[PDB]
Ligand binder design. Structure first.
Ligand code: HEM
Ligand code: HEM
Lengths: 454, 454
């Protein structure tokens, strides 16, 4: 009942009063983010609450954040909170724990170097052209456009060709066998889990594998097919070459490819939607970005790896968007052993949590946090931003391994789209933007905007 | 179903074919010991089987046994198999794991030194006299005696005064408040657990604490009472003094005292019964032991610590009994990480098992294993006994911490009993002795013998 609910009272840590069995989960009615900001505003730098019986400790002090994410990663704060009915996804790098995660991180780290990324941009760029070609049609109809569907088809085009070498236009090919199987995904089951964490083992024995055994065996056979028939430059080849610590197994290969698919579709499509909202509701910013793009890329020259990393205002626009909308919302680590960090006893089993969304909007570090102002990230003001307040990709050894790939993928899309189109709010546009009430950082209403052709 | 049942086939390890869900548990119909001997006789030095979905690897090679118990204890084979609905018993030394066990083992190790044991023998000896005084009555009735009840009352007399300083004659005081609460214990639930290990978490959330919340709070209040009112020489005082790593908590104190109670009652009473059976069915041995006792202890002098450790034939009789009847039956360790030991890959999560009972009766190391022959442990033949075949108290850092205390407690009882009585088989005596068909090493029928007075 209230088994471990006396933990934060005994340590003298403040926080909302938990209910028996439920803990503080009813306080999620306003959203993960609004709960984090309220607890921040009403308790200060550190507070605690309970996801059911699971005690969660929020910290907002930069030095303590650095200690948890960097200084004591391998020793105390190595793993994230487990775990829904896992299946074979236990071998996924973002799921793996302790030395198995360390093994996977080192086997996959060379795959995300700038050298391998630079070799992926000619393929990624090919679907930027496909993107504008499908945008040209939906724009000439002369009526608002749902960016979630055009960026979604784009994001899937990129991940299918970067993960396996499958080159298909998703929007105009409604059902390639690969496209549909990848679209087979995916509340309130997620809150049932945190309040019934003891029922997770039962889902394993019931053969209730979270992923459909059809799509799972489809990818596992698609990969082993691909393995057989096989100078390719996709994530699969980069992982097959690393098989010739201890090399990756074939099932471990499927697990990582599944992760990248999940990693790319939700994030990049949603962040591209947030950027286009901000660009459309701040026309002066949209114009300055297009003027910069036309400068480095004359007469709509194709963007390359080197020309992308040269665009400073583009990087300022991406970073300021990722401040207002950090899609991960939270950072989490489990405390492996009793530790004292920066004058504070953290007992074993506690989940330490960094409220990224709340920190990106705290008036202590940001002037007028609610306004979209790219000038915060100019070279002049970039220096006074604490890299442990602003953590859109986490930090430390377990930060986002695909950060460079995601920034490069989104910028290549933004450049090609802004070279050809302008974006204005229409009447269906939700202004101001409201965030979804659920447990994901996405717009409450799908972003709809006017698209004109240059 | 057969989720992990393909493990030993993939590694080329032999063993009985498992059934879906059940594994090899139906093969326990003859007993843990008969299953171990059959698998030993039918597979050689190493085999495997499944307790439900849990793979168990048996090993019988002495070098491999030394590597698992001693050489790689801290690194690979530190913990035992978990765990029924545990409750606060997670802080018990025999339940604790990894560094928490190491902490408890070092805090409790000084309590079991020979110095502290030597200070406990005047108290232990007091109830040896109480033992014969209750044996004198049940013998003068002139009819067979159930040793389980006289050794049981003796064993409880010893553990109550050694763990807390409570000095009561249990047999003639049917219900002292302490005696009854300790007697509140304790199939087929145990086999349900191994075939439904995923239902163990549900027993925790249902507040189904394995131990009655009445006796649990009784001891916890009995100890905290004892703590308050308090030159005493019991296990509690030795643990209270150690509170003045990090010192033991009050609830940790209750957890260890509960363990010693469980450790002493079942074992010592049952081993004393086995010894008296063997003494009664081998009168020549019983006479030679009494002749030795009368030599070192003239005219029935009281046994002391130094006079006990001087008796060689007594130690030979105890050791030969513990060979035929090793009450722990098995030794078990969980493999923490992938390891290679003595030319063999042991994957993570496997339970490595030493079949002590089967090794103590293997014709490879023992001539005529089924016969009770104390001469195997004479100084002449003691040298050629491998300390990893004969493991009545385990071995390595996690062996029986109370071995010296148990040997001293049983010998003090044997000496005082043999100074006064002789033991012959009666008609109710089960000859030959049969072992219980369940999952405990105890006689199938209670041992009943004739008792005469010297
Ligand atoms: C806008 C896009 C993205 C954002 C904002 C983002 C952000 C994040 C964040 C905040 C974390 C947690 C880091 C931590 O806990 O400290 C993370 C982890 C991770 N991300 Fe991303 N991510 C993005 C896209 C991607 C992509 C495209 C990939 C791969 C193709 C990827 C792969 C991963 C992996 C594997 C991890 C876990 C690494 C580990 O546990 O060792 N992410 N990401
Ligand atoms: C005839 C009597 C006894 C026998 C044959 C016996 C045998 C054993 C065996 C075989 C083990 C397992 C060792 C291993 O896994 O390697 C063990 C463990 C243990 N025994 Fe005993 N035992 C006896 C009595 C006692 C008594 C009287 C106590 C305490 C008062 C005790 C306390 C313990 C503890 C605490 C452990 C676990 C130690 C740890 O996990 O670190 N035992 N015993």
């Amino acid at each position: 009942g209230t088994h471990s609910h006396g933990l934060f009272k005994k340590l003298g840590i403040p926080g909302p009063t938990p209910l028996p069995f439920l803990g503080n989960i009813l306080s999620y009615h306003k959203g993960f983010c609004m709960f984090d900001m309220e607890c921040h505003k009403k308790y200060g730098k550190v507070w605690g609450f309970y996801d059911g019986q699971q005690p969660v400790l929020a910290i907002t002090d930069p030095d303590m954040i650095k200690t948890v994410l960097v200084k004591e990663c391998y020793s105390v704060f190595t793993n994230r909170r487990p775990f829904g009915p896992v299946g074979f996804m236990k071998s996924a790098i973002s799921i793996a724990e302790d030395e198995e995660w360390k093994r996977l991180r080192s086997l996959l780290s060379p795959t995300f170097t700038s050298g391998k990324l630079k070799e992926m941009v000619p393929i990624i760029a090919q679907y930027g052209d496909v993107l504008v070609r499908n945008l040209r049609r939906e724009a000439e109809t002369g009526k608002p456009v749902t960016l979630k569907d055009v960026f979604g088809a784009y994001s899937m085009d990129v991940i299918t060709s970067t993960s396996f070498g499958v080159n298909i236009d998703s929007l105009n090919n409604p059902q390639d066998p690969f496209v549909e199987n990848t679209k087979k995904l995916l509340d309130p089951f997620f809150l049932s889990i945190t309040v019934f964490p003891f029922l997770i083992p039962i889902l394993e024995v019931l053969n209730i594998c979270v992923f459909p055994r059809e799509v799972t065996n489809f990818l596992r056979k698609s990969v082993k097919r691909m393995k057989e028939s096989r100078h390719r430059v996709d994530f699969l080849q980069l992982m097959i070459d690393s098989q010739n610590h201890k090399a990756l197994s074939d099932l471990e290969l499927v697990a990582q490819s599944i992760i990248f698919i999940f990693a790319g579709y939700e994030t990049t499509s949603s962040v591209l939607s947030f950027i286009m909202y901000e660009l459309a509701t701040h026309p002066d910013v949209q114009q300055k970005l297009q003027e910069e793009i036309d400068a480095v890329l004359p007469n709509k020259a194709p963007p390359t790896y080197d020309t992308v990393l040269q665009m400073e205002y583009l990087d300022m626009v991406v970073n300021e968007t990722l401040r207002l909308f950090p899609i991960a919302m939270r950072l989490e680590r489990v405390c492996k052993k009793d530790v004292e960090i920066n004058g504070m006893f953290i007992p074993k089993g506690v989940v330490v949590m960094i409220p990224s969304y709340a920190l990106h909007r705290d008036p202590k570090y940001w002037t007028e946090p609610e306004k979209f102002l790219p000038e915060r990230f100019s070279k002049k003001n970039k220096d006074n931003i604490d890299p442990y307040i602003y953590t859109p990709f986490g930090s430390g050894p377990r930060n986002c391994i695909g950060m460079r790939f995601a920034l490069m993928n989104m910028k290549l899309a933004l450049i090609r789209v802004l070279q050809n189109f302008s974006f204005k709010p229409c009447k269906e546009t939700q202004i101001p933007l409201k965030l979804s009430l659920g447990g994901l950082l996405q717009p409450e209403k799908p972003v709809v905007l006017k698209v004109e052709s240059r």
